[PDB]
Structure 1
Amino acid sequence: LIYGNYLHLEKVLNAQELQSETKGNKIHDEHLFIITHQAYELWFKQILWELDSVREIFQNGHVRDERNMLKVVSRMHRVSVILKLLVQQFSILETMTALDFNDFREYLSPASGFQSLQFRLLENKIGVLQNMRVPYRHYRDNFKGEENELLLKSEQEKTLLELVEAWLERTPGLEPHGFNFWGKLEKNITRGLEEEFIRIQAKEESEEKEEQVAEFQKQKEVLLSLFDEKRHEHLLSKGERRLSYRALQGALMIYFYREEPRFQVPFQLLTSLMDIDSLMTKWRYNHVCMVHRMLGSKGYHYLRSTVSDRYKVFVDLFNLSTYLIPRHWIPKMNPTIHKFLEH
């Protein structure tokens, strides 16, 4: 077994054909453009391999055995390490000037990044919604045959978002007849808000007091909005939220009780999911900046639109920031109950 054979370098290193050269006008920098994209695609393949392995662990029930959480979090962390490298990799293509790009651009048409199957597969499998996608036209229209079918499978199969959702719905602590997290949280917040009101009311009529009253009212609205299941359902329908109400409860349970042993690695998983969303957005941003630098202000706009919350699959995990409360309002988990979160 030889290195070059093991790595199939006879394929990988014989895959570079400059269209400039095919058309009798070889342009040096075209080679960079080819290699950069091939490297992105190798890493996309690796991301898919990790992400699929993690999807399988959820879908086949292995995640139920918490022995497997370490593997889940290491692979999701690995995805974020790769994406970080992919963001840095734009630095290489920034050594190509627009003037030099302009010398081989003609030989590329009509090929486009839009035709990256793997990038679409990755978006789909994480959980980007097609209805939420900004029109440029459809996206699969640029694909046909087996590729179009792969895309459909990726759209119909359970996404990472859906699989994490189901798992969040089973989070220990949500049972009304058990720790009854939601009931206690609602009560504690109501009481806390009542207490705060009394204090502010006790102050003497002033601009300061009014400013406090106003802030209180805002905080109150936000915190209480959390317990409005109907508003959540409405916001789901508009696609401004993605997780079921019960999954949201599970996520918040993990956030508030992150230090409890059974929740430590789950918390890291939630953190990694947010990281992946952020890094995917950063990839899109750098790509936009690159298109602009090469093609000029007039694609740029469409791609700019992709840098938005509509492409953030785990927006709900980010938005749990909005519902931070004083620590002493969090329902206490005394050791008496702590046992259910021990292992």
Structure 2
Amino acid sequence: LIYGNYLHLEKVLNAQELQSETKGNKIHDEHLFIITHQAYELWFKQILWELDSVREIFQNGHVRDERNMLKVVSRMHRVSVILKLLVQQFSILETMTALDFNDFREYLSPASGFQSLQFRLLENKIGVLQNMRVPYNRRHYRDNFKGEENELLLKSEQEKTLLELVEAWLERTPGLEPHGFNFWGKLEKNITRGLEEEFIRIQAKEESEEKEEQVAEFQKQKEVLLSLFDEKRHEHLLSKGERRLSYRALQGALMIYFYREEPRFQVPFQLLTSLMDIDSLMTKWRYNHVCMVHRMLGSKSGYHYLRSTVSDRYKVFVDLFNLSTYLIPRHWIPKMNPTIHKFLEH
């Protein structure tokens, strides 16, 4: 067993055919463009491998055994460490000038990155919605794909996504039981009370621009906080695709946020953090890719379509980010005395 055989370098290092050279006009920088993409694809394959393994742990019920949370968080962390490198890797392609790219661009048409099967598979498996995908020149993405490739794409759309598997798991989060710790009920009450207290305070002040300013802020804060308990408004925002998680999953997430220090919630909290990281880094990748298309082609547009992809429309875990909106004073958080805490001890 030799290194080169183990790594099948007979394949990996015999995969560089410059179209410029095939058409009798070799252009040096084409080689860089080929290798950069091959490297992106190697790492996309590794991301798919980690992500598929984590999806499986959820789908098959292994995640139910909390012994497996360390593995889940390590692999999701690994996904983000890979993505950070993928973002840095753009700096290599920045060493190619547009004038140099212009010397071989002709020999590439009509190929495009759009045809990256694995990038699409990755978007789908995380949880990007087709309905929300931005049309490129009034066209569907899968239009450019055929055969078994079109097949794999379909499975990726139809199989349970990371978002859905996390949703299901969040729905079973301990503490939501109305007959138990009754998190949601206690939270509603504590916030309603606290708002009442606060209003009384402000109402006791004397008419002024200040008082109005405080009253106005209060009203805004009140509306945001109480909207959390409006299950119907949530259902509505779900159907418009401005939210992604079920109402119950949202309750589980908030439970984990507020009780993160409780032992059973420590690693779950880290998982939520890494899911947000993955969304952020995916968006950073899209951003750096856009900046590059611009530098090479100008405003001539793919640039604008790609710019549209840099939006909340492509953020699968938007709901986890938006739990910042619902931050309250610590003393309003339902108290969990050891009496009612033992259920969250390893």
Name the TM-score, length of structure 2 as normaliser.
0.99
Q: Distance in 2 between matches of 1:140 and 1:50?
A: 24
Structure 1 counterpart SS, 2:278: helix
Q: Distance in 2 between matches of 1:328 and 1:24?
A: 74
Q: Distance in 2 between matches of 1:54 and 1:258?
A: 22
Q: Distance in 2 between matches of 1:146 and 1:217?
A: 56
Q: Distance in 2 between matches of 1:194 and 1:134?
A: 44
Q: Distance in 2 between matches of 1:112 and 1:45?
A: 19
Q: Distance in 2 between matches of 1:43 and 1:81?
A: 11
Aligned pair count? 343
Deviations 1:166-196 (A, max 9, x none): 0000000000000000000000000000000
Structure 1 segments, 4+ long, off by >3 Å, are none
Question: After alignment, is 277-286 or 333-342 more displaced?
Answer: 333-342
The correspondence for 2:290, drawn from 269, 288, 291, is 288
Q: Distance in 2 between matches of 1:112 and 1:180?
A: 53
Deviations 1:149-177 (A, max 9, x none): 00000000000000000000000000000
Shift of residue 8, structure 1, vs aligned partner: 0.1
Q: Distance in 2 between matches of 1:152 and 1:57?
A: 22
Deviations 1:273-292 (A, max 9, x none): 00000000000000000000
Q: Distance in 1 between matches of 2:75 and 2:165?
A: 16
Shift of residue 260, structure 1, vs aligned partner: 0.1
What residue is the counterpart of 1:20 in the other structure? 20
What residue is the counterpart of 1:181 in the other structure? 183
Is 1:314 aligned to residue 345 of structure 2?
no
Gap regions ≥5 residues in structure 2? none
Shift of residue 250, structure 1, vs aligned partner: 0.1
Deviations 1:23-71 (A, max 9, x none): 0000000000000000000000000000000000000000000000000
Shift of residue 146, structure 1, vs aligned partner: 0.1
Q: Distance in 1 between matches of 2:121 and 2:67?
A: 29
- Correspondence 1:15-164 to 2 at 5 A: 15-136=15-136, 137-164=139-166
Q: Distance in 2 between matches of 1:331 and 1:129?
A: 35
Q: Distance in 2 between matches of 1:27 and 1:58?
A: 48
Deviations 1:98-147 (A, max 9, x none): 00000000000000000000000000000000000000000000000000
Shift of residue 320, structure 1, vs aligned partner: 0.1
Shift of residue 226, structure 1, vs aligned partner: 0.2
Shift of residue 297, structure 1, vs aligned partner: 1.1
Q: Distance in 2 between matches of 1:104 and 1:201?
A: 72
Shift of residue 3, structure 1, vs aligned partner: 0.1
- Let me know the Cα RMSD of the aligned residues: 0.2
What residue is the counterpart of 1:257 in the other structure? 259
Shift of residue 338, structure 1, vs aligned partner: 1.2
Shift of residue 233, structure 1, vs aligned partner: 0.1
Structure 2 counterpart SS, 1:131: helix
Q: Distance in 2 between matches of 1:179 and 1:186?
A: 13
Q: Distance in 2 between matches of 1:278 and 1:123?
A: 13
Q: Distance in 2 between matches of 1:330 and 1:98?
A: 56
Gap regions ≥5 residues in structure 1? none
Q: Distance in 2 between matches of 1:297 and 1:184?
A: 54
Q: Distance in 2 between matches of 1:290 and 1:88?
A: 13
Shift of residue 237, structure 1, vs aligned partner: 0.2
Q: Distance in 2 between matches of 1:321 and 1:289?
A: 29
Is 1:278 aligned to residue 280 of structure 2?
yes
Structure 1 counterpart SS, 2:198: helix
Shift of residue 337, structure 1, vs aligned partner: 1.2
Q: Distance in 2 between matches of 1:99 and 1:280?
A: 29
Q: Distance in 2 between matches of 1:73 and 1:219?
A: 34
Deviations 1:266-313 (A, max 9, x none): 000000000000000000000000000000011000000000000000
Percentage of pairs with the same residue: 100
